[PDB]
C-alpha cells in the first residue's frame, strides 16, 4: 500500500527530500540510524495542512503534503553524518474497526563526503564440474560501491526461491561489496539463463549480469 | 522519554514481559500505547495498541498491561520465531506527539547448534581481465553466531588482504557471513591453490580452489 | 457479565474510585472498556474510553485504570456535579458485542440542607365546570429529599383523595416533589379555605388557600 | 445530531418499530427500564447490513439500516410488559482523533393492557394579587393522562427559564397527572400571554392551553 522513494547519498549539510505515497489519518515519519532503535519525527494531515515535529528535529525538519497525488513529503536540512539512518513513512488505517498501521519500505540516507561509487558486478560461477548434488551455487560478486543499500534480484524478479544476498562487508578502502548466490539444479546448468540484476539507488547504476550461460 | 531493558531471554514454552516505564506525564496519562516487533531488515510490526489490543491476525500470545506508569508486553508459550527487537511507543493525551522506547532485544535460548555451510568462488575471468581477482568464501547457516575464518596461499597462512563481515542474524535465527580475499592476478596464478578455513566450535570445514 | 457496587459515597474534595469487575475473558482480554455518567433524565455521557482516554471536553478529574480483571474510574477534587450513575461498559476483542454493568450511585456529601418552598394552586373555573376539583401543591428546593405533607379541610386533617409523589432529584443536587389533593366542587365551595402542609425537618411550611 | 421517533404505548405481544435519524460506524441500541441499568441490545452497519444482537434479545429483535435515509430501526416482538423501558440509538464518531459517541433523546415503549388516555389541561393561575415580590407562580395541569411521558413548553419554546415540569404522580384511579409552573414578572401578569404546549405522543395529543390572559 505504502511506497517510498529509493536510497540516496548527501554531502553534509545538504537538503535531502523523500517521499511517500498512498483512511484518512496522519502520515508519520519515523528514523532509525542503523543499529539504533526507533525515533518519532512528525507527522502531516492531507487536508488543512497541519503538521507537528518532535521537539529535537523541529525547524530543520519540513513534513508537506500534496494531496493532488496523495503524497508526503519530509524534507530535512543541516544534514550531519549522524543524521544516517533509515526513514519510514507511516500511516495508521481501520479494517475491522481495528486498527493497523503501514510502514513505508524504508529509504537509508547515508550521510558523508566520501565520494559516491557504483558497483562493478562480476559473475561467480562454478566449475560445472565443480558441483555435486543435482544442485549448484552461482551469483554476482557487487564489488566496489559506495554508499549502501545494494538491491540484488535474479532474472528480474521471476526467479525468487534459494536466493540468498549477503550483507555487505566494508573494505579497508572504504568501499562495500556483497554477494548474492542463487541454488540451481545442476543438470541444466550451463543452459538455463541467470541473470542477476544490481540497483544501487545513490548513484543511479544499474547492472544486469548475464552469470549462466 | 520511555526505558526498556536493552535485551531479555527466555526459553522456549515459558512466557516473558519487557517492561516500559515512563512516567505520570506520558504513559500513565492515557493508554494510546503500543508494541512493536522489529525482525533483521524489516519494517516495524505493531503488535499490540491501546496498551492491550491485537492487530488483526496478530498472535493471541502476545498480551498487553499496564501497572501504574510502566506499560507490559508479555509473550506466551515464547517461540524461535519471536526472537526480535521489541518497541513500545506512547502519544500524548491530545494526539499530536509521539515517542519510542529504548528498544529491546529478545532472545529465545535452547536453540539447536549449527555447523557452518561454506561456498568458494574463484576469480573470474571477467575480474582477471580488470587486472583484479577477488576469493569469494560465503558461510551459512550456522548457531552460535561466532566463526574465525583462516586463509591460506597453499598451506600457508596469509592475512594481508583479508576482509571479514561480522556474522548477522539470517530470518531463520541462524548466522551468516561472507569473508573477501583480495590479490592480484599474478598472486592468484602463482600459487598451487587457494582455501578458505571455517572454524565453528568443535568443527571445521574448509573449501579450496585452483587457477 | 460486569459488576459494580451498587452505589458510593465520598466527601467534596476527596478522590473515589469505583470498580467495574469481570473475567479474563472480558474486562481482561483487552482494554475496549469505558465509563459512562448519567444525570437525572439525560442520556448516559461518554466519560472514559479505552480504559483510560477523555473524550474532548470531558474533564481531567476523571481517570481510568486496571489492575488485573478489573477496570476502575477515578474521580479526583470530587464535586457536588458529580452526584449521578456510573457505568462501565466492555466490547468483545472482535468488536461485535457490548455488555453495560450494574451501575453505580454515587453520591456527595456535605451537600447543604435546604427547606422547601411550597406552591399552592386552587383548582380552574375549567375544571369546576368539568365538576371536577384539584389543588395542587408544588415542593421543591429541598434536601435531603425528605418530606412529609399533610392536607386541611379548613383545620380538620383531611386524608381522602391524597395523592403525593415520592421526592425525586432536580438537576441542583436538591428534590423536588407534587402533591395533588382531590375532592368535589361542592366539597370545594364548602369549606371556608383548604392548605398544604410540608413539613421537612425542623421546617413546617404551610400554604392555604379559599374558593 | 440524532433524532429518533415518538414514545409509544404497546399492548403486550404486539410489535414496536422504533427508528433513529442520523462518520460511519454502526448504529447500536441501548435500553433502560425505568430505575434500571443500561442494557446492550444490537447494532448494524449501513453497509453490507451486518447486524449484532446480544443473546438475550437475539431472535426477536430486528434491527435494520435505510441507506436512502440514513435512518436504522429497532424492532422488538413479543413485547412482554418487563419491556417497558427507554430505547437509545447510539453511534461512535470521530472528532479530534478524538472518541465521542452521540445518543439519542431515547424513546419511552410502556407495555400495558391498560387503555391510553390523552391528557386534559387546565390552567393553573395566581389570584394576581396573590403573589408577593415582582415574580408570580403560574402553570398547566395536565391531569388524567396514560401512559408516560408528557411534555411541555411555553410559549412555543420562546419561553424557557424559570420553568419547573414536575414529576407525575400516579394516581390511585392508574391515570397520571403533572404539573408545569411558569415564574413571571408580575407586573405584566395579566397583559402578557402565557400559553403552555403539551404533547403526549402516545395517544398523539396535543394541547395548548392560555393561562393568560
Ligand atoms: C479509533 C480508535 C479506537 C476505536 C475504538 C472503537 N470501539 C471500542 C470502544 S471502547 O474502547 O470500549 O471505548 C468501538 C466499539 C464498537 C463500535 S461499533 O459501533 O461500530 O460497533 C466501534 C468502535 C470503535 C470506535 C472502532 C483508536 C484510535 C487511536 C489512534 N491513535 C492512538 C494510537 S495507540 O493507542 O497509541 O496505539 C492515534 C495516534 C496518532 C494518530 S495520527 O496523528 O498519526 O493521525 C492517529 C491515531 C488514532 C486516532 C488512529
Known amino acids: 500500500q505504502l511506497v517510498q522513494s529509493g536510497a540516496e547519498v548527501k554531502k553534509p549539510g545538504s537538503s535531502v527530500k523523500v517521499s511517500?505515497?498512498?483512511?484518512?489519518?496522519?502520515?508519520?515519519?519515523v528514523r532509525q540510524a542503523p543499529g539504533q532503535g526507533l525515533e518519532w519525527?512528525?507527522?502531516?494531515?492531507?487536508?488543512?495542512?497541519?503538521?507537528?515535529?518532535?521537539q529535537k528535529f523541529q525547524g530543520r525538519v519540513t513534513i508537506t503534503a500534496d494531496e493532488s497525488t496523495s503524497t508526503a513529503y519530509m524534507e530535512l536540512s543541516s544534514l550531519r553524518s549522524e543524521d544516517t539512518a533509515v526513514?519510514?513513512?507511516?500511516?495508521?488505517?481501520?479494517?475491522?474497526?481495528?486498527?493497523?498501521?503501514?510502514?513505508?519500505?524504508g529509504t537509508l540516507v547515508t550521510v558523508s563526503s566520501a565520494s559516491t561509487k557504483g558497483p562493478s558486478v562480476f559473475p561467480l560461477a562454478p566449475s560445472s564440474k565443480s558441483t555435486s548434488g543435482g544442485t549448484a551455487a552461482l551469483g554476482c560478486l557487487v564489488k566496489d560501491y559506495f554508499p549502501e543499500p545494494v538491491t540484488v534480484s535474479w532474472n528480474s524478479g521471476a526467479l525468487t526461491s534459494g536466493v540468498h544476498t549477503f550483507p555487505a562487508v566494508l573494505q579497508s578502502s572504504g568501499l562495500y561489496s556483497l554477494s548474492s548466490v542463487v541454488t540451481v539444479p545442476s543438470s541444466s546448468l550451463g543452459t538455463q539463463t541467470y541473470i542477476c540484476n544490481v540497483n544501487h539507488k545513490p548513484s543511479n547504476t544499474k547492472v544486469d549480469k548475464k552469470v549462466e550461460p | 522519554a520511555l526505558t526498556q531493558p536493552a535485551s531479555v531471554s527466555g526459553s522456549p514454552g515459558q512466557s516473558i514481559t519487557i517492561s516500559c516505564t515512563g512516567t505520570s506525564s506520558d504513559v500513565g496519562s492515557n493508554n494510546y500505547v503500543s508494541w512493536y516487533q522489529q525482525h533483521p531488515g524489516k519494517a516495524p510490526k505493531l503488535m499490540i495498541y491501546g496498551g492491550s489490543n491485537r492487530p488483526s491476525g496478530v498472535s493471541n500470545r502476545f498480551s498487553g498491561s499496564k501497572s501504574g506508569n510502566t506499560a507490559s508486553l508479555t509473550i506466551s508459550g515464547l517461540q524461535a520465531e519471536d526472537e526480535a527487537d521489541?518497541?513500545?511507543?506512547?502519544?500524548?493525551?491530545?494526539?499530536?506527539?509521539?515517542?519510542?522506547?529504548?528498544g529491546t532485544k529478545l532472545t529465545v535460548l535452547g536453540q539447536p547448534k549449527a555447523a557452518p555451510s561454506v561456498t568458494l568462488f574463484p576469480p573470474s575471468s571477467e575480474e582477471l581481465q580488470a587486472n583484479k581477482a577477488t576469493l569469494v568464501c560465503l558461510i551459512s547457516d550456522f548457531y552460535p553466531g561466532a566463526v574465525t575464518v583462516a586463509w591460506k596461499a597453499d598451506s600457508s597462512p596469509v592475512k594481508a588482504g583479508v576482509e571479514t563481515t561480522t556474522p548477522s542474524k539470517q530470518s531463520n535465527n541462524k548466522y551468516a557471513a561472507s569473508s573477501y580475499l583480495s590479490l592480484t592476478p599474478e598472486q592468484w596464478k602463482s600459487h598451487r591453490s587457494y582455501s578458505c578455513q571455517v572454524t565453528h566450535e568443535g568443527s571445521t570445514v574448509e573449501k579450496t580452489v585452483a587457477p | 457479565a460486569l459488576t459494580q457496587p451498587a452505589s458510593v459515597s465520598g466527601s467534596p474534595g476527596q478522590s473515589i474510585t469505583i470498580s467495574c469487575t469481570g473475567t479474563s475473558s472480558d474486562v481482561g482480554s483487552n482494554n475496549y472498556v469505558s465509563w459512562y455518567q448519567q444525570h437525572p433524565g439525560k442520556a448516559p455521557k461518554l466519560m472514559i474510553y479505552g480504559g483510560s482516554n477523555r473524550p474532548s471536553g470531558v474533564s481531567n478529574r476523571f481517570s481510568g485504570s486496571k489492575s488485573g480483571n478489573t477496570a476502575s474510574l477515578t474521580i479526583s477534587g470530587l464535586q457536588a456535579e458529580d452526584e449521578a450513575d456510573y457505568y462501565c461498559?466492555?466490547?468483545?476483542?472482535?468488536?461485535?458485542?457490548?455488555?453495560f454493568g450494574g451501575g453505580t450511585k454515587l453520591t456527595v456529601l456535605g451537600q447543604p440542607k435546604a427547606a422547601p418552598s411550597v406552591t399552592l394552586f386552587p383548582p380552574s373555573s375549567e375544571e369546576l365546570q368539568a365538576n371536577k376539583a384539584t389543588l395542587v401543591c408544588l415542593i421543591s428546593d429541598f434536601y435531603p429529599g425528605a418530606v412529609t405533607v399533610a392536607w386541611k379541610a379548613d383545620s380538620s386533617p383531611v386524608k381522602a383523595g391524597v395523592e403525593t409523589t415520592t421526592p425525586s432529584k432536580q438537576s441542583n443536587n436538591k428534590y423536588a416533589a407534587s402533591s395533588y389533593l382531590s375532592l368535589t366542587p361542592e366539597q370545594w365551595k364548602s369549606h371556608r379555605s383548604y392548605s398544604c402542609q410540608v413539613t421537612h425537618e425542623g421546617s413546617t411550611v404551610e400554604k392555604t388557600v379559599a374558593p | 445530531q440524532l433524532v429518533q421517533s415518538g414514545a409509544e404505548v404497546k399492548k403486550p405481544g404486539s410489535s414496536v418499530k422504533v427508528s433513529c435519524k442520523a462518520?460511519?460506524?454502526?448504529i447500536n441500541w441501548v435500553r433502560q427500564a425505568p430505575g434500571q441499568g443500561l442494557e446492550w441490545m444490537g447494532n448494524?452497519?449501513?453497509?453490507?447490513?451486518?447486524?449484532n444482537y446480544a443473546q438475550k434479545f437475539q431472535g426477536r429483535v430486528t434491527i435494520t439500516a435505510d441507506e436512502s435515509t440514513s435512518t436504522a430501526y429497532m424492532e422488538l416482538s413479543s413485547l412482554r410488559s418487563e419491556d417497558t423501558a427507554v430505547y437509545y440509538c447510539?453511534?461512535?464518531?470521530?472528532?479530534?482523533?478524538?472518541?465521542?459517541?452521540?445518543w439519542g433523546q431515547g424513546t419511552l415503549v410502556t407495555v400495558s393492557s391498560a387503555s391510553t388516555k390523552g391528557p386534559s389541561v387546565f390552567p393553573l393561575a395566581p389570584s394576581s394579587k396573590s403573589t408577593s415580590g415582582g415574580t408570580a407562580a403560574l402553570g398547566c395541569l395536565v391531569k388524567d393522562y396514560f401512559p408516560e411521558p408528557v411534555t411541555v413548553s411555553w410559549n412555543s419554546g420562546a419561553l424557557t427559564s424559570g420553568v419547573h415540569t414536575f414529576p407525575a404522580v400516579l394516581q390511585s384511579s392508574g391515570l397520571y397527572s403533572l404539573s408545569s409552573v411558569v415564574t413571571v414578572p408580575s407586573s405584566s401578569l395579566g397583559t402578557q400571554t402565557y400559553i403552555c404546549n403539551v404533547n403526549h405522543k402516545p395517544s398523539n395529543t396535543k394541547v395548548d392551553k392560555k393561562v393568560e390572559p
Open positions: 448494524i452497519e449501513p453497509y453490507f447490513g451486518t447486524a
Open positions: 447510539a453511534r461512535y464518531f470521530m472528532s479530534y482523533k478524538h472518541l465521542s459517541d452521540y
Open positions: 461498559r466492555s466490547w468483545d476483542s472482535n468488536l461485535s458485542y457490548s455488555v
Open positions: 462518520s460511519n460506524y454502526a
